[PDB]
Design a protein around this ligand. Structure first.
Ligand code: HEC
Ligand code: HEC
Ligand code: HEC
Ligand code: HEC
Ligand code: HEC
Ligand code: HEC
Ligand code: HEC
Ligand code: HEC
Ligand code: HEC
Ligand code: HEC
Ligand code: HEC
Ligand code: HEC
Lengths: 407, 407
């Protein structure tokens, strides 16, 4: 559809809301289209009309959210992207240990605005924490560039114009940009000047598009092999481009957890990342010890090495480096994850698992517990992207001790 | 929260000092956390933000200090732990018998550093008496391990890694360490190599974690039954691990009061411990004669016997043994006690009580006396953990004649 840049130009837009007499999208009546001539009531329904295919038997191809008619109150959202399902924003859990605990769905993700799909905007976070960016204006075109104008050339520069776009910058089986044609940006997100016309403020992006290489055929379970995304240089600065006061390139002279190009691993931290396998099983290696729940920047922009370190198979499970950096997106899965702060981690209880009597592991036996937190064992399994009770310690503590071994 | 080891990982730390837009701890402004990313101005406010619940009607659950808004100048701190309240460090008493006497609150406890709770560091004791350990650096993580790394295995060995942690080593209704999972240390204190990263000296712990079994539901008055803590082997050596020159395993070849594994009771001393009930009432027995104000090591590490001799009820009031040792923590309650040298004893006046005219006992009638020492009778009662004028002799001398009968 997109193929690096702008797409089939009626795929998202519509001109008269009519094609063969029929309404092109029933959210608005015929002979009136909607906002910015799009197919939908908002700027995100024109994304969610072929993304979010209603009716799924697993994470299929490129979809990023699951229809509400597919999920009851007993199952998890059924698409496993590196961004995660937006269906997690409509999950409010109530478990009754020593009182009650409400883990509402507002805190689990970016509440995009989509009236026809009941994606209500975030009510508690009225603006972005860090900047002045509104949450009643956040759409899918608010951080992605829907036209995909941003290119990359043979010298790695990124420009809004010049040589035309031939394919996507992600997907390691892509092509290199030539002297006659450019390759589009990684996951066509805007940068260094991007602002939608629908915004009436000084909300211009001032950070470049993040260099990374995602793997093709990425919607998968991670019970067998892990999804390695290259995450090269500018992911933390791009997340800082709208959450201004959050990133931290200098630790400590800000007293925030470091995230940026200057947020290097120590030689101590990189050894603790490579050693950690389970709780107390500090026997890991440089190679064959990687966790997608805590990635790192590997802070170069050499796309040959980035396509080398981007593989669906386990042939590229190299661990940390002393010169490796810290992502924003190390914790905080990008779209939504279902863990009350959009993080990849269960941080509301002290150990993420339960050992059943003869000591193998489970996630629990009952939603009304403190360890499992008002959900099924299948929903906690799918929240860890199909990672079952094994690959973890039986009483494994919170997974953000990966690169400190504070166990 | 902790459950033997490291906890809900945002329970003490914070990453951006923001959650739902609001500041996670108002001692530091938003988008800057504090020292070591903790919730508070110091490393102890991140302990005292859910410990020390402001507003109490007695010793409730697990709290260790009382808020200053709960105590006037007429009442005592209201939590009775085996460590004692840190509120006792802010009690300066002035009684005017033949001049005046100032019993300042610096001498009554470990002055931890907490700027938001006005716990000022100790000014007279600049370092630890016995070592070179500073008092301007003492925090709750300075003698406890805040991550609780130290484990114990099925063979009683203690290691920093190996099998993971499932529960606390204290609390006699705990579980035994299995071949698949370890039990955390007694009262998660560090040992044999513990040193915080915030210290820039050679202050490494070289003594093991003390073997003991504390009783569950311990915050209580002791007007009815006593709180028996097992206190097994290494409490005196662990207190020696930072107060180096103080402990004494060989008496006399040091001329200090003995405290250690080699500081055994004599056959004379163990008989004097069992005989002492009150002043002059030397009629006690082996069984049914125990005082929590003067415990002993019972110097084994057999945790079955230690959980046997750890009971809130009076079913385990066995007295001394000829092979029993002497704690540090026999005198000197651990956190703070309010007796000008952190001891469990009133050692500033010759008899701890007053007989009122027809000879029953009181603690006094007036703070401006020598027997009651500038405090209420209720504050002296709560300083003895709710022990009233009875259970004592009417003119009972200083309680450290328990195991000598030097009355
Ligand atoms: C100028 C006054 C007119 C009139 C009378 C019509 N158009 Fe358009 N049109 C455009 C595109 C891309 C489509 C197909 C997809 C869509 O509707 O968005 C159409 C469709 C129609 C139809 C119906 C055809 C059908 O199959 O039902 C009719 C009757 C029609 N148009 C009439 C594109 C454009 C424009 C592109 C910017 C312009 C201008 C117009 N049309 C203008 C007109
Ligand atoms: C409106 C509902 C949409 C749709 C249809 C998509 N997005 Fe996003 N997206 C964002 C970021 C930072 C990434 C990259 C994360 C990573 O690579 O680890 C993505 C990725 C995607 C994909 C590719 C699948 C993937 O996980 O890589 C797709 C198909 C996709 N998006 C579609 C950022 C955002 C937002 C930032 C606040 C917003 C809103 C959206 N995306 C919205 C949408
Ligand atoms: C990389 C540059 C970023 C950005 C833009 C954000 N984070 Fe974090 N975050 C983490 C945790 C554990 C929480 C919840 C508790 C806490 O704040 O300590 C958060 C919270 C946020 C928010 C606000 C959410 C809210 O409910 O108010 C925002 C806007 C945010 N983050 C942005 C954890 C981490 C990390 C773990 C080590 C990493 C790295 C980052 N976040 C990085 C970023
Ligand atoms: C910062 C204000 C804290 C907090 C919240 C706690 N401590 Fe301590 N502690 C120390 C020792 C040697 C013990 C065991 C004493 C015994 O078992 O007899 C304890 C015990 C505790 C407990 C359990 C309650 C109890 O009395 O057993 C709790 C909840 C607790 N602590 C919390 C030693 C120290 C210190 C040594 C100088 C420092 C400082 C602190 N603790 C600080 C704190
Ligand atoms: C880089 C991909 C980013 C990460 C990681 C996060 N963001 Fe955002 N963000 C924006 C707004 C207006 C909000 C409030 C709306 C809402 O919360 O639904 C947020 C919120 C978050 C949150 C908190 C989610 C919660 O409700 O608890 C997290 C953890 C988060 N964001 C992480 C705006 C923007 C934005 C503007 C165009 C960008 C590029 C990003 N955010 C990027 C990231
Ligand atoms: C085993 C639990 C211990 C007992 C019993 C005592 N200590 Fe300490 N200690 C340390 C410092 C730096 C000081 C000076 C700071 C201050 O006094 O507030 C102290 C002080 C004491 C005192 C005197 C209190 C007074 O002001 O009169 C007593 C009676 C005492 N300590 C008993 C340091 C440390 C430490 C370093 C990490 C450890 C493990 C201990 N102390 C342990 C014990
Ligand atoms: C609303 C304006 C959006 C946004 C923000 C995105 N899409 Fe789609 N999309 C479609 C298909 C078939 C694919 C895979 C094939 C391909 O990428 O060429 C995608 C992929 C994406 C991506 C990933 C691109 C990358 O470089 O990896 C992104 C970021 C994305 N989309 C965003 C199909 C449709 C479609 C109807 C056929 C509609 C409408 C949209 N997409 C709308 C949007
Ligand atoms: C600051 C880093 C600290 C330190 C040094 C300690 N805590 Fe806590 N604590 C909390 C709760 C609910 C309990 C009882 C339940 C349980 O122990 O699992 C405790 C208990 C302790 C202990 C005793 C442990 C033992 O093995 O007996 C100790 C030594 C201790 N704490 C030290 C709750 C909190 C909490 C917020 C919910 C905060 C923050 C802390 N604790 C912080 C600290
Ligand atoms: C889906 C991937 C789209 C395709 C294909 C095209 N457009 Fe688009 N457009 C899309 C969105 C989600 C928005 C809203 C942005 C906002 O400001 O809210 C737009 C907007 C426009 C605009 C408005 C001005 C601007 O955004 O700067 C114009 C003029 C526009 N689009 C033109 C346009 C053309 C010419 C396209 C085909 C070659 C085209 N769009 C395709 C989503 C999508
Ligand atoms: C409260 C009980 C805490 C929890 C839960 C976690 N941490 Fe912690 N941490 C805590 C304190 C009081 C301190 C200060 C120690 C000092 O040196 O002053 C720390 C410190 C750290 C550090 C610094 C390095 C070090 O102390 O050796 C790190 C890297 C750290 N903490 C990591 C960490 C992780 C990964 C945690 C959750 C799994 C975690 N901490 C929880 C108190 C508490
Ligand atoms: C992919 C790496 C990564 C993960 C995930 C991560 N951290 Fe860290 N953390 C680091 C690095 C690197 C440092 C900097 C160490 C240094 O400066 O020596 C650091 C520093 C810290 C510090 C300050 C320590 C110091 O020495 O000053 C704290 C506290 C901390 N992290 C907490 C956390 C918490 C809590 C989590 C779980 C939410 C977490 N981290 C997850 C990599 C990580
Ligand atoms: C729980 C036991 C315990 C308590 C409390 C205790 N002592 Fe002792 N004390 C002993 C033991 C055991 C010895 C060693 C006796 C021996 O070596 O024969 C001893 C020895 C002594 C000695 C040396 C006696 C000798 O024979 O050499 C003195 C003096 C002394 N203690 C004073 C005190 C004082 C003063 C207090 C009150 C602060 C006190 N003790 C509290 C147990 C205790």
């Amino acid at each position: 559809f997109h193929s690096g840049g702008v797409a089939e130009c009626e795929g998202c837009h519509t001109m008269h809301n009519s094609l063969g007499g029929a309404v092109m999208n029933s959210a608005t009546a015929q002979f009136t289209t909607g906002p910015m001539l799009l197919q939908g009531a908002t700027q995100s329904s024109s994304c969610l009309n072929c993304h979010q295919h209603a009716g799924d038997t697993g994470p299929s191809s490129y979809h990023i959210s699951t229809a509400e008619a597919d999920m009851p109150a007993g199952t998890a959202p059924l698409q496993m992207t590196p961004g995660g399902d937006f269906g997690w924003v409509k999950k409010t859990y109530t478990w009754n240990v020593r009182g009650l605990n409400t883990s509402e769905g507002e805190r689990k993700g970016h509440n995009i605005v989509a009236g026809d799909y009941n994606y209500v905007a975030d009510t508690t976070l009225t603006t972005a924490p860090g900047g002045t960016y509104p949450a009643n204006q956040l759409h899918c075109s608010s951080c992605h560039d829907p036209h995909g104008k941003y290119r990359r050339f043979v010298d790695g520069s990124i420009a809004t114009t010049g040589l035309p776009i031939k394919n996507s910058g992600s997907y390691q089986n892509s092509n290199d940009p030539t002297a006659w044609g450019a390759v589009g940006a990684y996951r066509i997100l805007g940068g260094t000047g991007y602002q939608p016309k629908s915004l009436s403020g000084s909300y211009a992006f001032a950070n470049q598009v993040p260099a990374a290489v995602a793997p093709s055929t990425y919607n998968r379970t991670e019970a067998t092999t892990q999804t390695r995304v290259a995450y090269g240089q500018g992911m933390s600065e791009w997340c800082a481009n709208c959450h201004t006061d959050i990133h931290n390139s200098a630790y400590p002279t800000n007293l925030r957890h470091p995230a940026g190009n200057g947020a290097k691993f120590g030689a101590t931290i990189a050894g603790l990342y490579n050693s950690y396998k389970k709780s107390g099983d500090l026997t890991g290696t440089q190679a064959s010890a990687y966790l997608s729940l805590a990635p790192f920047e590997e802070g170069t922009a050499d796309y040959t090495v980035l396509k080398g370190h981007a593989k669906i198979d386990d042939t590229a499970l190299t661990g940390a480096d002393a010169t490796s950096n810290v992502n924003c997106l190390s914790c905080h899965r990008a779209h939504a994850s279902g863990f009350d702060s959009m993080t990849r981690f269960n941080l509301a209880y002290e150990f993420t698992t339960i050992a059943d009597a003869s000591g193998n592991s489970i996630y629990g036996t009952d939603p009304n517990t403190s360890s499992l937190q008002g959900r099924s064992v299948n929903e906690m399994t799918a929240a860890y992207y199909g990672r079952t009770a094994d690959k973890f310690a039986p009483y494994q503590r919170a997974l953000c001790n990966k690169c400190h071994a504070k166990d």
